[PDB]
PDB file of C-alpha atoms (C1' of nucleotides) in Angstrom:
ATOM      1  CA  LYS A   1      82.952 144.681  88.496  1.00 35.21           C
ATOM      2  CA  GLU A   2      84.439 142.695  85.607  1.00 35.96           C
ATOM      3  CA  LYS A   3      83.826 138.957  85.383  1.00 39.33           C
ATOM      4  CA  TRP A   4      85.958 136.470  83.475  1.00 39.35           C
ATOM      5  CA  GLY A   5      85.183 132.961  82.300  1.00 40.46           C
ATOM      6  CA  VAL A   6      86.485 130.228  80.016  1.00 39.86           C
ATOM      7  CA  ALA A   7      84.921 128.786  76.863  1.00 42.53           C
ATOM      8  CA  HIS A   8      85.866 125.188  76.132  1.00 42.26           C
ATOM      9  CA  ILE A   9      85.166 124.377  72.485  1.00 40.78           C
ATOM     10  CA  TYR A  10      85.176 120.712  71.489  1.00 39.60           C
ATOM     11  CA  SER A  11      85.266 120.422  67.709  1.00 38.50           C
ATOM     12  CA  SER A  12      85.060 117.205  65.705  1.00 36.11           C
ATOM     13  CA  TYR A  13      83.994 116.229  62.209  1.00 40.20           C
ATOM     14  CA  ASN A  14      80.579 115.144  63.537  1.00 37.79           C
ATOM     15  CA  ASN A  15      79.606 117.789  66.122  1.00 40.27           C
ATOM     16  CA  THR A  16      80.644 120.804  68.179  1.00 42.27           C
ATOM     17  CA  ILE A  17      80.275 121.656  71.870  1.00 42.26           C
ATOM     18  CA  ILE A  18      80.550 125.053  73.571  1.00 40.87           C
ATOM     19  CA  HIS A  19      80.863 124.992  77.353  1.00 41.59           C
ATOM     20  CA  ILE A  20      81.323 128.142  79.436  1.00 40.63           C
ATOM     21  CA  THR A  21      82.738 127.892  82.932  1.00 38.95           C
ATOM     22  CA  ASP A  22      84.287 130.018  85.624  1.00 37.95           C
ATOM     23  CA  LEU A  23      88.039 130.590  85.631  1.00 37.81           C
ATOM     24  CA  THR A  24      88.625 127.283  87.426  1.00 34.69           C
ATOM     25  CA  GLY A  25      86.338 125.210  85.204  1.00 34.97           C
ATOM     26  CA  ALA A  26      84.853 123.652  88.345  1.00 34.64           C
ATOM     27  CA  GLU A  27      81.527 125.523  88.193  1.00 34.94           C
ATOM     28  CA  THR A  28      79.512 125.376  84.984  1.00 33.87           C
ATOM     29  CA  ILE A  29      77.391 128.201  83.595  1.00 29.34           C
ATOM     30  CA  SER A  30      76.127 127.358  80.101  1.00 29.46           C
ATOM     31  CA  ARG A  31      76.589 124.240  77.968  1.00 30.21           C
ATOM     32  CA  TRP A  32      75.190 123.904  74.442  1.00 31.02           C
ATOM     33  CA  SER A  33      75.818 121.524  71.546  1.00 27.13           C
ATOM     34  CA  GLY A  34      75.112 121.270  67.849  1.00 24.73           C
ATOM     35  CA  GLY A  35      72.388 118.654  68.066  1.00 21.50           C
ATOM     36  CA  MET A  36      70.511 120.916  70.454  1.00 22.90           C
ATOM     37  CA  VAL A  37      69.588 123.284  67.612  1.00 22.52           C
ATOM     38  CA  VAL A  38      68.997 121.023  64.590  1.00 24.55           C
ATOM     39  CA  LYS A  39      67.011 117.884  63.807  1.00 21.74           C
ATOM     40  CA  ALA A  40      69.165 116.108  61.221  1.00 25.68           C
ATOM     41  CA  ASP A  41      72.370 114.423  62.375  1.00 23.13           C
ATOM     42  CA  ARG A  42      74.338 115.163  59.187  1.00 25.59           C
ATOM     43  CA  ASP A  43      74.289 118.918  59.954  1.00 22.54           C
ATOM     44  CA  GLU A  44      75.448 118.993  63.590  1.00 21.28           C
ATOM     45  CA  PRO A  45      78.991 120.085  62.560  1.00 24.90           C
ATOM     46  CA  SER A  46      77.463 122.945  60.571  1.00 28.08           C
ATOM     47  CA  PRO A  47      79.232 126.283  61.105  1.00 26.87           C
ATOM     48  CA  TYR A  48      75.703 127.680  61.345  1.00 26.85           C
ATOM     49  CA  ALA A  49      74.925 125.351  64.248  1.00 25.05           C
ATOM     50  CA  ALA A  50      78.211 126.400  65.813  1.00 25.74           C
ATOM     51  CA  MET A  51      77.095 130.032  65.529  1.00 26.68           C
ATOM     52  CA  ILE A  52      73.657 129.411  67.040  1.00 28.69           C
ATOM     53  CA  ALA A  53      74.961 127.349  69.956  1.00 29.66           C
ATOM     54  CA  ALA A  54      77.721 129.839  70.758  1.00 28.60           C
ATOM     55  CA  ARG A  55      75.259 132.735  70.612  1.00 25.11           C
ATOM     56  CA  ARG A  56      72.813 131.128  73.038  1.00 26.79           C
ATOM     57  CA  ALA A  57      75.595 130.062  75.396  1.00 26.58           C
ATOM     58  CA  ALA A  58      76.992 133.599  75.386  1.00 27.82           C
ATOM     59  CA  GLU A  59      73.592 135.185  75.991  1.00 24.93           C
ATOM     60  CA  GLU A  60      72.913 132.984  79.005  1.00 22.31           C
ATOM     61  CA  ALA A  61      76.450 133.579  80.285  1.00 19.99           C
ATOM     62  CA  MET A  62      76.053 137.351  80.091  1.00 20.93           C
ATOM     63  CA  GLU A  63      72.689 137.091  81.845  1.00 19.75           C
ATOM     64  CA  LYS A  64      74.520 135.212  84.593  1.00 17.68           C
ATOM     65  CA  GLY A  65      77.033 138.065  84.713  1.00 16.91           C
ATOM     66  CA  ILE A  66      80.110 137.015  82.742  1.00 18.32           C
ATOM     67  CA  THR A  67      81.700 139.758  80.629  1.00 17.23           C
ATOM     68  CA  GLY A  68      84.886 138.273  79.168  1.00 17.22           C
ATOM     69  CA  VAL A  69      86.014 134.787  78.191  1.00 17.58           C
ATOM     70  CA  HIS A  70      89.303 133.129  77.502  1.00 19.22           C
ATOM     71  CA  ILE A  71      89.096 130.424  74.847  1.00 19.39           C
ATOM     72  CA  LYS A  72      90.378 126.840  74.831  1.00 19.77           C
ATOM     73  CA  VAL A  73      89.794 125.064  71.536  1.00 17.85           C
ATOM     74  CA  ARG A  74      90.144 121.308  71.344  1.00 15.47           C
ATOM     75  CA  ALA A  75      89.970 118.573  68.713  1.00 16.13           C
ATOM     76  CA  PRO A  76      89.320 114.981  69.847  1.00 14.11           C
ATOM     77  CA  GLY A  77      92.955 113.970  69.694  1.00 13.76           C
ATOM     78  CA  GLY A  78      94.848 111.174  71.359  1.00 16.72           C
ATOM     79  CA  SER A  79      94.506 108.153  69.114  1.00 19.24           C
ATOM     80  CA  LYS A  80      92.068 110.184  67.006  1.00 19.01           C
ATOM     81  CA  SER A  81      92.466 113.175  64.709  1.00 16.49           C
ATOM     82  CA  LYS A  82      94.497 116.221  65.730  1.00 18.44           C
ATOM     83  CA  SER A  83      92.813 118.544  63.229  1.00 16.52           C
ATOM     84  CA  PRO A  84      89.775 120.507  64.473  1.00 14.57           C
ATOM     85  CA  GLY A  85      86.558 120.812  62.558  1.00 15.34           C
ATOM     86  CA  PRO A  86      84.936 123.721  60.747  1.00 14.93           C
ATOM     87  CA  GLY A  87      82.747 125.027  63.568  1.00 12.11           C
ATOM     88  CA  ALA A  88      85.589 126.231  65.799  1.00 11.80           C
ATOM     89  CA  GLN A  89      86.240 129.600  64.164  1.00 10.48           C
ATOM     90  CA  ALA A  90      82.533 130.127  63.519  1.00  9.47           C
ATOM     91  CA  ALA A  91      81.924 129.686  67.239  1.00  7.33           C
ATOM     92  CA  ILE A  92      84.714 132.069  68.238  1.00  4.84           C
ATOM     93  CA  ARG A  93      83.412 134.743  65.877  1.00  2.68           C
ATOM     94  CA  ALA A  94      79.796 134.395  66.969  1.00  2.00           C
ATOM     95  CA  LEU A  95      80.920 134.573  70.599  1.00  2.00           C
ATOM     96  CA  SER A  96      82.755 137.844  70.039  1.00  2.00           C
ATOM     97  CA  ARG A  97      79.850 139.276  68.037  1.00  2.00           C
ATOM     98  CA  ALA A  98      77.205 138.414  70.632  1.00  2.00           C
ATOM     99  CA  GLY A  99      78.903 140.818  73.044  1.00  2.00           C
ATOM    100  CA  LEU A 100      81.454 139.076  75.248  1.00  2.00           C
ATOM    101  CA  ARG A 101      85.031 140.278  75.310  1.00  2.00           C
ATOM    102  CA  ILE A 102      87.904 137.985  74.428  1.00  2.00           C
ATOM    103  CA  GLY A 103      91.196 137.152  76.072  1.00  2.00           C
ATOM    104  CA  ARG A 104      93.800 134.548  75.203  1.00  2.00           C
ATOM    105  CA  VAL A 105      92.968 131.866  72.623  1.00  2.00           C
ATOM    106  CA  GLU A 106      94.829 128.603  73.228  1.00  2.00           C
ATOM    107  CA  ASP A 107      94.642 125.181  71.598  1.00  2.00           C
ATOM    108  CA  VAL A 108      94.647 122.356  74.191  1.00  2.00           C
ATOM    109  CA  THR A 109      94.367 119.167  72.058  1.00  2.00           C
ATOM    110  CA  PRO A 110      96.027 116.176  73.854  1.00  2.00           C
ATOM    111  CA  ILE A 111      99.180 114.906  72.020  1.00  2.00           C
ATOM    112  CA  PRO A 112     100.792 110.980  72.527  1.00  2.00           C
ATOM    113  CA  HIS A 113     104.517 111.338  73.462  1.00  2.00           C
ATOM    114  CA  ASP A 114     103.787 108.003  72.555  1.00  2.00           C
ATOM    115  CA  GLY A 115     100.355 106.443  72.475  1.00  2.00           C
ATOM    116  CA  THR A 116      98.030 103.383  72.354  1.00  2.00           C
ATOM    117  CA  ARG A 117      97.163 101.827  68.927  1.00  2.00           C
ATOM    118  CA  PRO A 118      94.365 103.400  66.746  1.00  2.00           C
ATOM    119  CA  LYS A 119      91.328 101.464  65.434  1.00  2.00           C
ATOM    120  CA  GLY A 120      92.178 100.878  61.742  1.00  2.00           C
ATOM    121  CA  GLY A 121      93.643  97.383  61.413  1.00  2.00           C
ATOM    122  CA  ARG A 122      96.978  97.810  59.594  1.00  2.00           C
ATOM    123  CA  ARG A 123      95.181  98.632  56.336  1.00  2.00           C
ATOM    124  CA  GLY A 124      92.755 101.360  57.397  1.00  2.00           C
ATOM    125  CA  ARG A 125      89.246 102.003  56.214  1.00  2.00           C
ATOM    126  CA  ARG A 126      88.761 100.570  52.724  1.00  2.00           C
ATOM    127  CA  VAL A 127      85.455 102.224  51.826  1.00  2.00           C
TER     128      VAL A 127
ATOM    129  C1'   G B   1     171.805  58.446  30.797  1.00  2.00           C
ATOM    130  C1'   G B   2     171.206  63.852  31.255  1.00  2.00           C
ATOM    131  C1'   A B   3     168.657  68.941  32.477  1.00  2.00           C
ATOM    132  C1'   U B   4     166.612  71.941  36.580  1.00  2.00           C
ATOM    133  C1'   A B   5     162.848  77.071  34.459  1.00  2.00           C
ATOM    134  C1'   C B   6     157.939  75.772  36.765  1.00  2.00           C
ATOM    135  C1'   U B   7     155.265  72.601  40.535  1.00  2.00           C
ATOM    136  C1'   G B   8     156.244  69.345  45.003  1.00  2.00           C
ATOM    137  C1'   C B   9     159.586  68.038  49.511  1.00  2.00           C
ATOM    138  C1'   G B  10     163.298  69.707  52.964  1.00  2.00           C
ATOM    139  C1'   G B  11     166.425  73.986  55.371  1.00  2.00           C
ATOM    140  C1'   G B  12     167.337  79.311  56.075  1.00  2.00           C
ATOM    141  C1'   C B  13     165.730  84.778  55.209  1.00  2.00           C
ATOM    142  C1'   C B  14     161.858  89.061  54.064  1.00  2.00           C
ATOM    143  C1'   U B  15     157.599  92.302  54.899  1.00  2.00           C
ATOM    144  C1'   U B  16     153.903  94.263  51.201  1.00  2.00           C
ATOM    145  C1'   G B  17     148.786  90.200  52.613  1.00  2.00           C
ATOM    146  C1'   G B  18     146.787  88.802  57.593  1.00  2.00           C
ATOM    147  C1'   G B  19     146.775  88.744  62.963  1.00  2.00           C
ATOM    148  C1'   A B  20     148.405  91.205  67.817  1.00  2.00           C
ATOM    149  C1'   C B  21     149.257  95.833  70.724  1.00  2.00           C
ATOM    150  C1'   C B  22     148.993 101.503  72.091  1.00  2.00           C
ATOM    151  C1'   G B  23     146.520 106.401  71.581  1.00  2.00           C
ATOM    152  C1'   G B  24     142.620 110.359  71.348  1.00  2.00           C
ATOM    153  C1'   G B  25     137.801 109.993  69.309  1.00  2.00           C
ATOM    154  C1'   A B  26     132.282 108.103  66.768  1.00  2.00           C
ATOM    155  C1'   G B  27     128.004 105.291  67.070  1.00  2.00           C
ATOM    156  C1'   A B  28     119.386 103.773  68.277  1.00  2.00           C
ATOM    157  C1'   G B  29     125.696  97.209  68.587  1.00  2.00           C
ATOM    158  C1'   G B  30     124.121  93.817  73.140  1.00  2.00           C
ATOM    159  C1'   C B  31     122.785  92.650  78.663  1.00  2.00           C
ATOM    160  C1'   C B  32     121.520  94.305  83.797  1.00  2.00           C
ATOM    161  C1'   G B  33     119.629  97.933  87.271  1.00  2.00           C
ATOM    162  C1'   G B  34     117.385 102.593  88.749  1.00  2.00           C
ATOM    163  C1'   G B  35     114.491 107.014  87.593  1.00  2.00           C
ATOM    164  C1'   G B  36     110.894 109.443  84.400  1.00  2.00           C
ATOM    165  C1'   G B  37     107.277 111.524  80.242  1.00  2.00           C
ATOM    166  C1'   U B  38     102.813 112.642  77.875  1.00  2.00           C
ATOM    167  C1'   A B  39      98.554 110.101  76.179  1.00  2.00           C
ATOM    168  C1'   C B  40      94.615 106.312  76.934  1.00  2.00           C
ATOM    169  C1'   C B  41      90.980 103.067  80.290  1.00  2.00           C
ATOM    170  C1'   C B  42      88.474 102.314  85.087  1.00  2.00           C
ATOM    171  C1'   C B  43      86.949 104.004  90.018  1.00  2.00           C
ATOM    172  C1'   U B  44      85.532 107.782  93.936  1.00  2.00           C
ATOM    173  C1'   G B  45      83.872 112.870  95.055  1.00  2.00           C
ATOM    174  C1'   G B  46      81.995 118.039  92.816  1.00  2.00           C
ATOM    175  C1'   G B  47      79.193 120.858  88.790  1.00  2.00           C
ATOM    176  C1'   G B  48      75.380 120.766  85.187  1.00  2.00           C
ATOM    177  C1'   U B  49      71.100 118.654  82.161  1.00  2.00           C
ATOM    178  C1'   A B  50      69.273 116.559  77.495  1.00  2.00           C
ATOM    179  C1'   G B  51      71.217 114.225  74.453  1.00  2.00           C
ATOM    180  C1'   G B  52      76.008 111.663  72.782  1.00  2.00           C
ATOM    181  C1'   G B  53      78.218 108.507  69.387  1.00  2.00           C
ATOM    182  C1'   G B  54      78.821 107.117  64.272  1.00  2.00           C
ATOM    183  C1'   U B  55      77.946 107.465  58.696  1.00  2.00           C
ATOM    184  C1'   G B  56      77.740 108.620  52.064  1.00  2.00           C
ATOM    185  C1'   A B  57      72.858 108.467  54.810  1.00  2.00           C
ATOM    186  C1'   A B  58      71.286 105.496  58.876  1.00  2.00           C
ATOM    187  C1'   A B  59      70.691 101.981  62.702  1.00  2.00           C
ATOM    188  C1'   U B  60      72.568  98.794  66.716  1.00  2.00           C
ATOM    189  C1'   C B  61      75.111 101.019  71.255  1.00  2.00           C
ATOM    190  C1'   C B  62      75.690 104.559  75.995  1.00  2.00           C
ATOM    191  C1'   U B  63      72.190 107.722  78.524  1.00  2.00           C
ATOM    192  C1'   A B  64      67.135 110.599  83.160  1.00  2.00           C
ATOM    193  C1'   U B  65      70.055 103.912  88.192  1.00  2.00           C
ATOM    194  C1'   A B  66      72.277 111.618  85.328  1.00  2.00           C
ATOM    195  C1'   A B  67      75.443 110.093  79.946  1.00  2.00           C
ATOM    196  C1'   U B  68      78.568 113.387  76.399  1.00  2.00           C
ATOM    197  C1'   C B  69      81.360 117.956  78.715  1.00  2.00           C
ATOM    198  C1'   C B  70      84.404 120.650  82.866  1.00  2.00           C
ATOM    199  C1'   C B  71      87.199 120.193  87.858  1.00  2.00           C
ATOM    200  C1'   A B  72      89.865 117.616  92.155  1.00  2.00           C
ATOM    201  C1'   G B  73      91.996 112.950  93.273  1.00  2.00           C
ATOM    202  C1'   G B  74      93.418 107.312  93.307  1.00  2.00           C
ATOM    203  C1'   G B  75      94.743 103.033  90.942  1.00  2.00           C
ATOM    204  C1'   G B  76      96.423 100.267  86.363  1.00  2.00           C
ATOM    205  C1'   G B  77      98.804  98.107  81.614  1.00  2.00           C
ATOM    206  C1'   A B  78     101.276  99.011  77.179  1.00  2.00           C
ATOM    207  C1'   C B  79     104.492 102.763  74.356  1.00  2.00           C
ATOM    208  C1'   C B  80     108.813 106.393  74.180  1.00  2.00           C
ATOM    209  C1'   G B  81     106.118 111.870  69.852  1.00  2.00           C
ATOM    210  C1'   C B  82     108.715 116.827  67.648  1.00  2.00           C
ATOM    211  C1'   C B  83     114.271 117.136  67.203  1.00  2.00           C
TER     212        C B  83
END
RNA sequence: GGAUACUGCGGGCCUUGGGACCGGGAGAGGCCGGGGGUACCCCUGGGGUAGGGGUGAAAUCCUAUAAUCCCAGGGGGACCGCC
């Protein structure tokens, strides 16, 4: 009968990771990244790479037997940026297209209720 | 020798300036003690396997002595988001 899983999507300005797991997240099924499907490093955060990686992950997941996924999208966060990258929505769309069904879509970025210092230096990057 | 408005000295009064006291309230004023919140780093188990990271583009660096990623736990030091 039906089978449910979870897609963790890690989205930064330099790459994207799609990782499909069981409900509990303790057993892993398919894990793909952006640098797995391109040669150049300046194109890993491509929405196209997001699409490809999500498609392959979803195909292998379905082969394993999963039918639906919940989605947890996640920017790096903490002391780093809270804004996700471009590949997140691309990956969600390509996942739904490739066949899997979709449940809840939640954003699980970590937020500082207050936090350790970030890496600038009181003036920031000065190009 | 005379005068007594103003200033000064001395002696009595006043309450407007100032100080004291009472009453219901406001406030991230200060010190001491207790209890907490996320986030971050390390360690130990489990899963999984080829890259991660970073840039304007790269390289050093970490990684097949199993990294990045997901899960269960244990320990630590700083800080108190939105309102």
